[PDB]
Scaffold this motif. Structure first.
Motif, mmCIF file in Angstrom:
data_model
loop_
_atom_site.group_PDB
_atom_site.id
_atom_site.type_symbol
_atom_site.label_atom_id
_atom_site.label_comp_id
_atom_site.label_asym_id
_atom_site.label_seq_id
_atom_site.Cartn_x
_atom_site.Cartn_y
_atom_site.Cartn_z
ATOM 1 N N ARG A 218 -25.844 -3.464 1.003
ATOM 2 C CA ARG A 218 -26.506 -3.754 -0.260
ATOM 3 C C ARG A 218 -27.373 -4.989 -0.071
ATOM 4 N NH1 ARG A 218 -22.194 -6.983 -3.977
ATOM 5 N NH2 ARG A 218 -20.875 -7.780 -2.285
ATOM 6 N N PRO A 219 -28.366 -5.204 -0.941
ATOM 7 C CA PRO A 219 -29.187 -6.414 -0.822
ATOM 8 C C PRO A 219 -28.521 -7.627 -1.448
ATOM 9 C CG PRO A 219 -29.968 -5.162 -2.658
ATOM 10 C CD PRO A 219 -28.833 -4.350 -2.048
ATOM 11 N N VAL A 220 -29.215 -8.761 -1.436
ATOM 12 C CA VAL A 220 -28.728 -10.001 -2.026
ATOM 13 C C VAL A 220 -29.479 -10.234 -3.327
ATOM 14 C CG1 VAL A 220 -28.042 -11.022 0.170
ATOM 15 C CG2 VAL A 220 -30.365 -11.400 -0.706
ATOM 16 N N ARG B 92 -38.161 -13.012 -2.325
ATOM 17 C CA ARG B 92 -38.615 -13.103 -0.944
ATOM 18 C C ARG B 92 -38.588 -11.735 -0.283
ATOM 19 N NH1 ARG B 92 -41.768 -16.750 -0.800
ATOM 20 N NH2 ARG B 92 -41.911 -15.777 -2.866
ATOM 21 N N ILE B 93 -37.521 -10.973 -0.521
ATOM 22 C CA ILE B 93 -37.367 -9.673 0.121
ATOM 23 C C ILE B 93 -38.570 -8.788 -0.169
ATOM 24 C CG2 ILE B 93 -36.040 -7.536 0.035
ATOM 25 C CD1 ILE B 93 -33.510 -9.342 -0.257
ATOM 26 N N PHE B 94 -39.171 -8.930 -1.353
ATOM 27 C CA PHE B 94 -40.328 -8.098 -1.663
ATOM 28 C C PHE B 94 -41.612 -8.704 -1.110
ATOM 29 C CE2 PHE B 94 -43.911 -6.667 -4.116
ATOM 30 C CZ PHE B 94 -43.692 -5.314 -4.266
ATOM 31 N N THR B 95 -41.703 -10.037 -1.073
ATOM 32 C CA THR B 95 -42.908 -10.669 -0.545
ATOM 33 C C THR B 95 -43.099 -10.325 0.923
ATOM 34 O OG1 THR B 95 -41.610 -12.684 -0.182
ATOM 35 C CG2 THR B 95 -42.921 -12.546 -2.187
ATOM 36 N N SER B 96 -42.010 -10.322 1.690
ATOM 37 C CA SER B 96 -42.081 -9.998 3.108
ATOM 38 C C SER B 96 -42.055 -8.489 3.331
ATOM 39 C CB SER B 96 -40.925 -10.678 3.849
ATOM 40 O OG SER B 96 -39.673 -10.178 3.412
ATOM 41 N N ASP C 126 -38.594 -1.405 -0.430
ATOM 42 C CA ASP C 126 -37.797 -0.674 0.555
ATOM 43 C C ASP C 126 -37.362 -1.629 1.666
ATOM 44 O OD1 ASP C 126 -38.744 1.335 -1.134
ATOM 45 O OD2 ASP C 126 -40.367 1.851 0.251
ATOM 46 N N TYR C 127 -36.406 -2.483 1.305
ATOM 47 C CA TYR C 127 -35.860 -3.466 2.234
ATOM 48 C C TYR C 127 -34.905 -2.830 3.239
ATOM 49 C CZ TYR C 127 -32.327 -3.013 -1.407
ATOM 50 O OH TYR C 127 -31.423 -2.513 -2.314
ATOM 51 N N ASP C 128 -34.124 -1.844 2.798
ATOM 52 C CA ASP C 128 -32.957 -1.414 3.565
ATOM 53 C C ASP C 128 -33.348 -0.711 4.859
ATOM 54 O OD1 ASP C 128 -33.902 0.568 1.570
ATOM 55 O OD2 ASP C 128 -32.326 1.849 2.387
ATOM 56 N N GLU C 129 -34.261 0.257 4.781
ATOM 57 C CA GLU C 129 -34.478 1.156 5.910
ATOM 58 C C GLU C 129 -35.086 0.438 7.109
ATOM 59 O OE1 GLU C 129 -36.973 3.600 3.659
ATOM 60 O OE2 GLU C 129 -35.354 4.613 2.580
ATOM 61 N N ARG C 130 -35.762 -0.690 6.883
ATOM 62 C CA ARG C 130 -36.387 -1.418 7.982
ATOM 63 C C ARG C 130 -35.372 -2.076 8.905
ATOM 64 N NH1 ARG C 130 -42.364 -3.604 8.013
ATOM 65 N NH2 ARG C 130 -43.287 -2.374 6.315
ATOM 66 N N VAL C 131 -34.101 -2.126 8.514
ATOM 67 C CA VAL C 131 -33.141 -3.020 9.153
ATOM 68 C C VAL C 131 -32.002 -2.240 9.790
ATOM 69 C CG1 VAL C 131 -31.383 -4.774 8.667
ATOM 70 C CG2 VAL C 131 -33.707 -4.991 7.711
#
Lengths: 136, 150, 150
Positions: free
Chosen positions: A97-99, A105-109, A113-118
């Protein structure tokens, strides 16, 4: 006198409708378990996580970034070479899950779709790290 | 097409002053009726809907018992979550203790919650059970059947 | 075609003195509006721009945060420089120490810096990352794997 009263009533109704439309466009309720964040260019998505209450957006800055801050499981298969060098297929489930706070920040960088990149990178590199040290 | 609409609008009789105000009131009443119509998720019998939203944060307080509970458009996205049971079944080819290929099936009855609908609905997705059960069952069967002989 | 335009221009009524000045003012306002329009790049969400420059060299100092920053027209085409992340993957077959062919993959996450965008874009063009990653990745993989047996 009646015509003026009717015209004023119509104007007031139109103004009320416009105000309600604006308010609704800025407003959206308390689900559980997203945490969207003000998506602003001047600072990049506002460093503040916008709080879990029915915490709004100002128009057009926070394209609702649906930071689905609940939990998701993700399965990564790895065809890892063991010590005897047997190609062993190992499927690892990573719950994740995210923080809440750093969703700005997670969206600026990254973005929404934060999860699939990691998950695949770390999981594959690491299952290799592990089962490489281990036998079939 | 627009010309026909303009002609029809012009053809409407120019009645007394009261009729226009009555029409405006009727239009407003209809809009309010639509807004009120959307405002309660009619979640089917034995179902639920926690709020679904996007709200710069999300407050997990307003969790919502069967049926009658209080939504709004784009404020409460509902989706009719089925707190009624939905079953599952998963299998596993294990290398057992004798290293015999043991194919074991396993019927898992996982159900969804009501006052903790959240983790389910969004990031587990509407397809929570599918995202959850398969390879946990696989790990279970392979670990315990590699531990058990034929 | 030109004759039709001339006839249309002549057909415009020759009204009092004021509307000519009004038309001139309107034309000037429109021209100013278009000139302002081209001069603020909407470098997309999460992107950046140097001053892509046509004068004074390309001043490598006036670099431009995401979105709200200003291009000169015909002195500033800030093609949309994506400072956001665009991942990459590069593989390599190597002769290991035992002269055994071994395939090794390597996925790279390389990004450009916002305040050194001037030469990053000028020198390394729009496609900096493609112009950068492959050779270093392969050098690293081969130099480290020729050292590492299979």
């Amino acid at each position: 006198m009646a015509a003026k009263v009717f015209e004023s009533i119509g104007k007031f109704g139109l103004a009320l409708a416009v105000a309600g439309g604006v308010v609704n466009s800025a407003l959206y309720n308390v689900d559980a378990g997203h945490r969207a964040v003000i998506f602003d260019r001047f600072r990049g998505v506002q460093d503040i996580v916008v709080g879990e209450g029915t915490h709004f957006l100002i128009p057009w800055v926070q394209k609702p970034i649906i930071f689905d801050c609940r939990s998701r499981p993700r399965n990564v298969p790895v065809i890892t070479g063991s010590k005897d060098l047997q190609n062993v297929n190992i499927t690892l489930r990573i719950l994740f899950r995210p923080v809440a706070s750093q969703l700005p920040r997670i969206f600026t960088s990254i973005g929404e779709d934060y999860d699939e990149r990691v998950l695949p990178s770390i999981t594959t590199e690491i299952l290799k790290s592990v089962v490489a040290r281990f036998d079939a | 097409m627009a010309q026909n609409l303009k002609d029809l609008a012009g053809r409407l009789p120019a009645g007394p002053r009261g009729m226009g105000t009555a029409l405006k009131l009727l239009l407003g009443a209809g809009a309010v009726a639509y807004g009120v119509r959307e405002s309660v998720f009619t979640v089917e019998g034995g179902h639920r809907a926690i709020f679904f939203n996007r709200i710069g944060g999300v407050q997990q307080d307003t969790i919502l018992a069967e049926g009658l509970h209080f939504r709004i458009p784009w404020f409460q996205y509902p989706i009719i979550y089925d707190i009624r049971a939905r079953p599952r079944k998963i299998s596993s080819p294990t290398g057992s203790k004798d290293l015999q290929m043991v194919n074991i099936s396993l019927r898992v009855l996982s159900r969804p919650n009501a006052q903790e609908l959240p983790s389910m609905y969004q990031r587990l997705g509407l397809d929570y059970e599918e995202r959850v059960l398969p390879s946990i069952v696989n790990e279970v069967l392979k670990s315990v059947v590699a531990k058990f002989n034929a």
